[PDB]
Amino acid sequence: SPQRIMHIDLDYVYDENLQQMDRNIDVLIQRVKDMQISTVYLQAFADPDGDGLVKEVWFPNRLLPMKADIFSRVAWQLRTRSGVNIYAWMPVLSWDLDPTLTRVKYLPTGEKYHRLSPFDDRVRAQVGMLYEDLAGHAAFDGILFHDDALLSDYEDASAPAITAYQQAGFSGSLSEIRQNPEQFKQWARFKSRALTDFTLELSARVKAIRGPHIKTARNIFALPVIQPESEAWFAQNYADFLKSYDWTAIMAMPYLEGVAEKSADQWLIQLTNQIKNIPQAKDKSILELQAQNWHQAISSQQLAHWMSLLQLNGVKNYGYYPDNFLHNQPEIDLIRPEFSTAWYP
């Protein structure tokens, strides 16, 4: 009954030698089966170097090269052999599409992921096509919208964004908006809503092909959850996520956030406190722990400890990213007792 998530990169199975690649996939399938959990968030795009721009994907499509046709069959094998549902993990904005498409612009007079602008209708149509191509070539149970759906307090300064702000009733001058706290706050919420609405447009396109049973999840950064004024520079709002998606996947990753080593546990506890202060928020949230320190491995002992910590703090829905499945990291013998749902009726 509780949700237990393995967040997996298909980058880790890839090999130009398909025979070897299929052997790698076999290990993945067995690994997830052995963990006895509920859900895999499965990478639909390639990004082995973590360059923050997607140039190729793991499924046939109309716009970008397919590095390998592996998403469909890995999704299928996980669902039928490994006992899990599958969310296709997709970027929202960070796509290396046509150069004439509008990119998110930073405020020219501003103090100082490679993202396309969600306010350009052509961006929305082309990203839409990619989601439609995914939906039309694979079977899966949900969509995980990537953490790249964010905008800073100096974004988006592009022409289509400015037009959208003006249509919404704001000044066309972002600097004038920023000079006034009341406007600045309302502008932040507008951007949050705009990003959310774009994801929901994409979900609708997938549902027009896969049908209405598709669930939605989206990654949210920890700051908008634990210090909500930070919405101003993230364009992510926790309550908005909880109302808009089936699952809000919180990146409960203290070391990614640069939290001091000995303060990780207290940071996690504080996050659970904030969540529990919103009724049923924990019931619609997944807390994703980190299994790597960006890279070294987080010890299996530490990761299991964090999972114990979440349970003891009343959080039952959780998971981790990434899984080094070809190398048993984290060690299944140590993680499984704090992760498996097999005991649950």
CB-based contact 156:191 (threshold 8 Å): yes
Of the candidates 259, 235, 213, which has an alpha carbon nearest to the alpha carbon of residue 156? 235
Strands 292-293 and 296-297: antiparallel
The torsion defined by the Cα of 266, 271, 274 and 278, in degrees rounded to 10, comes to -140
CB-based contact 183:170 (threshold 8 Å): yes
Domain enclosing residue 212, as ranges = 1-345
- Tokens representing 213 are 């049973």
- Tokens representing 139 are 């079977």
Phi, psi of 124 (to 5 degrees): -65, -35
Beta bridge partners of 32: none
Q: Around Cβ 312, how many Cβ atoms within 10 Å?
A: 10
* Backbone Cα Rg of the chain: 20
DSSP3 helix / strand / coil % (the chain, rounded to 5): 45, 15, 40
Euclidean distance between CA atoms 235 and 232, whole angstroms: 6
Helix (H, G, I), strand (E, B) or coil at 211: coil
Preceding amide of 254 cis, omega within 30? no
DSSP character at residue 329: B
**Beta-carbon contacts of residue 200 (< 8 Å; ≥ 6 apart):** 216, 244
Of the candidates 191, 198, 8, 188, which has an alpha carbon nearest to the alpha carbon of residue 92? 198
Beta bridge partners of 276: none
Euclidean distance between CA atoms 244 and 220, whole angstroms: 12
- Give the position of tokens 């499924």: 59
**Beta-carbon contacts of residue 193 (< 8 Å; ≥ 6 apart):** 240
**Beta-carbon contacts of residue 217 (< 8 Å; ≥ 6 apart):** 41, 87, 142, 143, 144, 145, 245, 246, 247, 248, 249, 286
Phi, psi of 31 (to 5 degrees): -60, -50
Name residue 295's amino acid: H
Domains in the chain: how many in total? 1
Breaks (C-N over 2.5 A) in the chain follow: 112, 294
Of the candidates 205, 243, 284, 247, which has an alpha carbon nearest to the alpha carbon of residue 87? 247
- Tokens representing 272 are 């659970």
Q: Taking phi first (over 0 means left), then psi (-120 to 50 degrees means alpha), and beta for anything else, what does residue 252 get?
A: beta
Of the candidates 40, 44, 43, which has an alpha carbon nearest to the alpha carbon of residue 86? 40
Phi, psi of 40 (to 5 degrees): -115, 130
Euclidean distance between CA atoms 327 and 54, whole angstroms: 26
- Give the position of tokens 């299928």: 76
- Tokens representing 72 are 């469909």
Sign of the torsion angle spanned by Cα atoms 209, 212, 215, 219: positive
List the alpha helices (DSSP H) in the chain: 18-35, 71-81, 121-135, 159-168, 174-178, 181-210, 222-226, 238-244, 264-276, 300-312, 332-335
**Beta-carbon contacts of residue 286 (< 8 Å; ≥ 6 apart):** 3, 5, 217, 247, 248, 249, 250, 317, 318, 319
Name residue 286's amino acid: I
C-alpha distances out from residue 127 to 138, 163, 167, 231, 305, Å:
17, 21, 23, 25, 39
Helix (H, G, I), strand (E, B) or coil at 27: helix
DSSP character at residue 153: T
DSSP character at residue 233: G
- The HSE-up count of residue 269 (CA atoms within 13 Å, CB side) is 9
Experimental method: X-ray
CB-based contact 176:119 (threshold 8 Å): no
- Tokens representing 152 are 């800073």
Phi, psi of 66 (to 5 degrees): -95, 115
Helix (H, G, I), strand (E, B) or coil at 39: strand
Euclidean distance between CA atoms 91 and 257, whole angstroms: 21
Q: What's 256's domain CATH number?
A: 3.20.20.80
CB-based contact 33:83 (threshold 8 Å): yes
Name residue 224's amino acid: P
- Tokens representing 329 are 């990291």
Euclidean distance between CA atoms 20 and 308, whole angstroms: 36
Please, what is the angle between helix 18-35 and helix 71-81, to 10°? Answer: 30
- Tokens representing 175 are 């600097």
Sign of the torsion angle spanned by Cα atoms 24, 28, 29, 34: positive
CB-based contact 139:75 (threshold 8 Å): yes
